[PDB]
Design a protein around this ligand. Sequence first.
Ligand SMILES: O=S(=O)(O)OC[C@H]1O[C@@](COS(=O)(=O)O)(O[C@H]2O[C@H](COS(=O)(=O)O)[C@@H](OS(=O)(=O)O)[C@H](OS(=O)(=O)O)[C@H]2OS(=O)(=O)O)[C@@H](OS(=O)(=O)O)[C@@H]1OS(=O)(=O)O
Ligand SMILES: O=S(=O)(O)OC[C@H]1O[C@@](COS(=O)(=O)O)(O[C@H]2O[C@H](COS(=O)(=O)O)[C@@H](OS(=O)(=O)O)[C@H](OS(=O)(=O)O)[C@H]2OS(=O)(=O)O)[C@@H](OS(=O)(=O)O)[C@@H]1OS(=O)(=O)O
Lengths: 100, 100, 128, 131
Amino acid sequence: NKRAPYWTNTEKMEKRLHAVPAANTVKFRCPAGGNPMPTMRWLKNGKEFKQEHRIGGYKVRNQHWSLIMESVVPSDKGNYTCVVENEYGSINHTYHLDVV
Amino acid sequence: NKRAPYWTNTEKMEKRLHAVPAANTVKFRCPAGGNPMPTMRWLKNGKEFKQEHRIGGYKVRNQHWSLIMESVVPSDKGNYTCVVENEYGSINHTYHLDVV
Amino acid sequence: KPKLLYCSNGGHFLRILPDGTVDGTRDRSDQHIQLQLSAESVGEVYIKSTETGQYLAMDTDGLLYGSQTPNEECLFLERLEENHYNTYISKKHAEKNWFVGLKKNGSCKRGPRTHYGQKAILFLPLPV
Amino acid sequence: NYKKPKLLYCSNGGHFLRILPDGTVDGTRDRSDQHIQLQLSAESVGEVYIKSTETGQYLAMDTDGLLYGSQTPNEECLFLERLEENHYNTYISKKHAEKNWFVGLKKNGSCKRGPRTHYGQKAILFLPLPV
Ligand SMILES: O=S(=O)(O)OC[C@H]1O[C@@](COS(=O)(=O)O)(O[C@H]2O[C@H](COS(=O)(=O)O)[C@@H](OS(=O)(=O)O)[C@H](OS(=O)(=O)O)[C@H]2OS(=O)(=O)O)[C@@H](OS(=O)(=O)O)[C@@H]1OS(=O)(=O)O
Ligand SMILES: O=S(=O)(O)OC[C@H]1O[C@@](COS(=O)(=O)O)(O[C@H]2O[C@H](COS(=O)(=O)O)[C@@H](OS(=O)(=O)O)[C@H](OS(=O)(=O)O)[C@H]2OS(=O)(=O)O)[C@@H](OS(=O)(=O)O)[C@@H]1OS(=O)(=O)O
């Protein structure tokens, strides 16, 4: 029953462009499934996204597959990619953030 | 690119038991995908569910993959199956409706 | 009189485990979801697991847990909603609207995160 | 700021409002689309008229909540635009304001009809974006 990851909620994820006013808050999600249960990480414009890259950092809620950044300012603009992995494979999806 | 049907929203579908007070309203969903876009139909306790099987009938909203029954009464207790198909295959899921 | 509290959020039955943690499960067969409710009402209840005798309680931080002795953190205001679901509110923390609730994945919600309008705080007692 | 050819983005499913030449209104996620550039105008304020710059067609709502495009501006074409708390914008039918009919979009891209919209939904929240 060994299986690579799969999205469990494709409907939510078809909203690719997230345009948000600052100083609002934004939430990206990529619910997934797999066996073993996969892990997830976020990329910003294709590269490691650490806490250190934004003032106030950001939260990742593994229990909901999501990434949350509050008080969105211009420097947040960009593509955010969620990468979900187990040892059989990975799936990814990208969202575009745009701060008005 | 020919492709059999697949669920696009497993997260919603995990709630199999829908326990509702009468005279409330209930909605069941099975968002799906597939190429060609598949069709859907509902079974009640394993057989055709036509309009004439409940007072007031019911609404199916293809645009949302859903089945909607208003003013739920005890005769509605049962298992409702959504069957989704194209010419490459079909998937099914069943919900148990319970009226309090 | 011994019911199963069904939560419409994700369709779980409220469950009080022997280690004192409270959560939800969809297993009808589970030994920890039969609950006895009781007054002195009007609408004020105790929720006890019949198999372990523990009481549903909420602590000062909003977290649900089971206690062996009944007590002030175990009273809940039971309200038949215009729905007709029932809702439960911590009696101690009523002035802040702390409801007993369940996330779609089965875990409990904490009082502070609940609010009138969520599906997570809606319960139906079902026969066992 | 910049009083010009905006793109009305709806935060419900991330679509830009679109007035197609057959008179139907709907959303799409294609930024290349020729039917999404819209001019807004007062007076005032915010009482706006939303027009497709491409066809000159105006956003309007019927007496049954349905959105459609008209060639002639007119009474069914005014909208009450309020900067929300938010800071999103919402548009309410001027003719059917005592009933709260907002311009809205479903997550699938099609329009909501006024009666099914209300304060609190993601569908009625727009943000005007530069072209
Ligand atoms: O509050 S609602 O009546 O709208 O019911 C669920 C909505 O809550 C969000 C975010 O707001 S919050 O509830 O105040 O935090 O979902 C996120 O939190 C809720 C509650 O979780 S928490 O532990 O109290 O914080 C979760 O839903 S539920 O547990 O009440 O069922 C969401 O998790 S999940 O969808 O159940 O997997 C959780 O996700 S996240 O923080 O955004 O990652 C809304 O967001 S959603 O998850 O994208 O659906 C929920 O619905 S809404 O239509 O946007 O209001
Ligand atoms: O109820 S509202 O008109 O306020 O809209 C959001 C909630 O409506 C549902 C259930 O149906 S309804 O309450 O009778 O309207 O969603 C369903 O309809 C809404 C609006 O559709 S409508 O037909 O134009 O009125 C659609 O969502 S949205 O447009 O706001 O985005 C759903 O379709 S879509 O995914 O948007 O394309 C539709 O689904 S269905 O008929 O049940 O199959 C509620 O259910 S939901 O779809 O699971 O969210 C919505 O929210 S609630 O949390 O249940 O209050």
